[PDB]
Every structure is written in structure tokens, then in C-alpha cells.
Design a protein around this ligand. Structure first.
Ligand SMILES: Cc1cc(O)ccc1Cl
Length: 223
């Protein structure tokens, strides 16, 4: 099938561990510290991953950063969602960090995680495949809607190239539903929405200043 989709598949980064501190008492501050630490490390691999998206590296450093700063959370969320598809009411932030309802409650993330679970539910019924997952991630980056893009035409070209990949993929792989590509595209609004909630919530966590956050995570969160 489509070359871009398969290129994205081989470019998929390895899983990373959350490694929550075994010596620290379980609390909302510990959970949040673990997640922001995990996100910070993921953001690093996400930046290296983006270089593999056709045309992305040709954009100016400025535009590349603009796209990443607008889409970073959507990309992080898609990952959690995909790793959770074969689970029930649980979010696999990492193999060693699976959050259920109670954990979400004590971490003060019940509403955010419930929203991510809404994403998981919809993708489950659509039987989201890994090929579609990786393409959606790339598309989410390209269709980020940054308010500071220098070369609008180039970004639209990137969006177009990736949209075509998904289209070509669905036309060849899912003959039974000539509208599957569109359905995949129609799941983006909920991703954008959930991402916005997460960024807002974690911004308030940054302000309350009771949770340490690393350089890269803070840079994205302060974009
Ligand atoms: C939403 C999210 C996703 C992820 O993969 C790591 C951390 C956080 Cl806070």
C-alpha cells in the first residue's frame, strides 16, 4: 500500500517508560510529575520523528517549530489513545503507567482522561489501524493551524501530501467503505478539543508551581 504510510510506520519511535519514582508516596503531585516528565521525554523523540515526514524538514526552522508548538499535545494524546485501544476504561500513558478511573481521580485528571477515553471509544468502533494512526499523527502536525506560519503554501502542500496518503491508503485497503478516509478526518476535531483542554489544565498546573516541569515541556506549554 501507500509508500508514505509505510514510511511513517518504519519511522514510528520505540515505546518509552514513565518510570515513576518508587521511593515517592503516591499522590496527585507524584502522578502529575511523572506525566510531565514522560511528556518532556516524548517531545524530544517527536521532534526527531517529524524530520521523517516528507517535506517537513524543508520548511523553515521557524515554521517547523510553529507546527510542533501547536500540535505537540495532539500528537502526545494520539499516542496514549492508540496504546489504549485494546484496553477497557484504562489509559496506557506507558507500559509501566496505566491509569484507571481511581488514579485519574486522585491525579485530578478525571475529566481530561474521560475525554481521552471518548477518543479511544470512537477509534475502537472504527477499528483504527496502526497505518491510520501514524498518518493521523502526521496530519495533525501539518493541520495544526498555527497563527505564525511564514510559508502558508508550503504547509498546505504538506497537509495535501499527507491527506493524499490517507486517501490512497483507504481507497486501496478499505474498499468496503469509500468514506472511511473522511471519517478518519472527522475525528480530528475531538483531538483538537481534547488537546486544548490538556494544555489549559497543565498550564494551570505550571502556574500553581507545585509540580516541577522540564525545559522542553515548559517551552511547548508556554508557546
Ligand atoms: C497527555 C499526555 C500524553 C503523553 O503521551 C504523555 C504525557 C501526557 Cl500529560
Amino acid at each position: 500500500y501507500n509508500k508514505i504510510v509505510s514510511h511513517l510506520l518504519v519511522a514510528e519511535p520505540e515505546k518509552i517508560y514513565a518510570m515513576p519514582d518508587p521511593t515517592v508516596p503516591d499522590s496527585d503531585i507524584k502522578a502529575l510529575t511523572t506525566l510531565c516528565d514522560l511528556a518532556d521525554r516524548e517531545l524530544v523523540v517527536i521532534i526527531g520523528w517529524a524530520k521523517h515526514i516528507p517535506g517537513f524538514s524543508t520548511l523553515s526552522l521557524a515554521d517547523q517549530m510553529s507546527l510542533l508548538q501547536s500540535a505537540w499535545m495532539e500528537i502526545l494524546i494520539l499516542g496514549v489513545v492508540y496504546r489504549s485501544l485494546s484496553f477497557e476504561d484504562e489509559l496506557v500513558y506507558a507500559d509501566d503507567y496505566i491509569m484507571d478511573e481511581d488514579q485519574s481521580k486522585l491525579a485530578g485528571l478525571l475529566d481530561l482522561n474521560n475525554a481521552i477515553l471518548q477518543l479511544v471509544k470512537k477509534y475502537k468502533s472504527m477499528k483504527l489501524e496502526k497505518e491510520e494512526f501514524v498518518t493521523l499523527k502526521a496530519i495533525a502536525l501539518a493541520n495544526s493551524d498555527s497563527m505564525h506560519i511564514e510559508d502558508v503554501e508550503a504547509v498546505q502542500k504538506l497537509q495535501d501530501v499527507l491527506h493524499e496518503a490517507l486517501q490512497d491508503y483507504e481507497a486501496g485497503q478499505h474498499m468496503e467503505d469509500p468514506r472511511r478516509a473522511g471519517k478518519m478526518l472527522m475525528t480530528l476535531p475531538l483531538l483538537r478539543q481534547t488537546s486544548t483542554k490538556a494544555v489549559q489544565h497543565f498550564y494551570n498546573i505550571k502556574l500553581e508551581g507545585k509540580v516541577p516541569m522540564h525545559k522542553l515541556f515548559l517551552e511547548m506549554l508556554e508557546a
